[PDB]
Each structure stands twice: as structure tokens, then as C-alpha cells.
Design an enzyme around this catalytic site. Sequence first.
Site, mmCIF file in Angstrom:
data_model
loop_
_atom_site.group_PDB
_atom_site.id
_atom_site.type_symbol
_atom_site.label_atom_id
_atom_site.label_comp_id
_atom_site.label_asym_id
_atom_site.label_seq_id
_atom_site.Cartn_x
_atom_site.Cartn_y
_atom_site.Cartn_z
ATOM 1 C CG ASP A 90 -14.003 8.208 -5.378
ATOM 2 O OD1 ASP A 90 -12.770 8.424 -5.516
ATOM 3 O OD2 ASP A 90 -14.454 7.493 -4.465
ATOM 4 C CD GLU B 170 -3.085 -0.757 -0.082
ATOM 5 O OE1 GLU B 170 -3.233 0.399 -0.552
ATOM 6 O OE2 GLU B 170 -3.708 -1.746 -0.516
ATOM 7 C CG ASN C 58 -8.280 6.986 -5.436
ATOM 8 O OD1 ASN C 58 -7.473 6.173 -5.890
ATOM 9 N ND2 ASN C 58 -8.457 7.164 -4.134
ATOM 10 C CG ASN D 282 -11.154 6.292 -0.355
ATOM 11 O OD1 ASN D 282 -12.308 6.685 -0.226
ATOM 12 N ND2 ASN D 282 -10.430 6.500 -1.472
ATOM 13 C CB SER E 190 -11.674 9.636 -2.706
ATOM 14 O OG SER E 190 -11.236 8.448 -3.336
ATOM 15 C CG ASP F 140 -6.547 5.646 -1.495
ATOM 16 O OD1 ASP F 140 -7.722 5.605 -1.051
ATOM 17 O OD2 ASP F 140 -6.242 5.260 -2.639
#
Length: 131
Positions: free
Chosen positions: A50, A36, A47, A61, A52, A54
Site C-alpha cells: 500500500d 518491531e 510496505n 504506520n 506505506s 512503518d
Amino acid sequence: GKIYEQCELAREFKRHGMDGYHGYSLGDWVCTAKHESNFNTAATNYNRGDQSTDYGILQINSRWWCNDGKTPKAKNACGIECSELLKADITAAVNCAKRIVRDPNGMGAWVAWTKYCKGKDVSQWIKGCKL
């Protein structure tokens, strides 16, 4: 932020009882964090789909889990500011991870866990670490 040593992270997970939490092992958690964030609390990922982001060592998120003040249709289920997940201290990330993992999908919430860790020998991640 900080980049954790592999065994240092394992020890932190154990400190928090992530160890066997909902059937998952220390190896599972360390394997996931590697893939990750490369063990880096400062890691972020945008991202487009949407709007968003992380955040942090487990790439939590901003749509569902933490508040970053800039994501549409956001829910902040962990009740935490995303920016705090970027600091060295990982207790907030761990607490939120425990919440996430309690959902029906489990560690499946991390696509990288299913890809790199699920159903594999994850004991190597902790081999040689003094725990």
C-alpha cells in the site's frame, strides 16, 4: 535517533502509565518494541502493498496513524508527523500507541506482539530492571 536500553525503555513506558494500560503490561510493550524496531527509534520499514512506511520504536504506520506526506489513502489518526517518531524522544510514539491500542484489536495491531509476546511469560523482559 537512539537505541534504547531494554530497562531504560521499560522505565519510559512506566513513566507514561503504559503499565496496566487497557490490561497490557510493561513486559508486553518491551517485548513488542524489541521485535518491531530492535529498540531503535530510527527504524523504518517500507510496505509495497500500500506504499506505506512503518516508523520508529513501535513501527507506527503512515497509512492509518501518522502523516509522512507520501502515502496514498492516508488518515493520520494520531495527528502526528511520522518523521517525529524517528527522534530519540518517544512520547509521541507512546501517545499514538495508546490511541492504537484503544481500537478493538488492542495490541493485536502489532502482528509481532501476537507472535512473540501474547500469552507468554513477558515478566522476563522487565526482570532485573530497577523500576
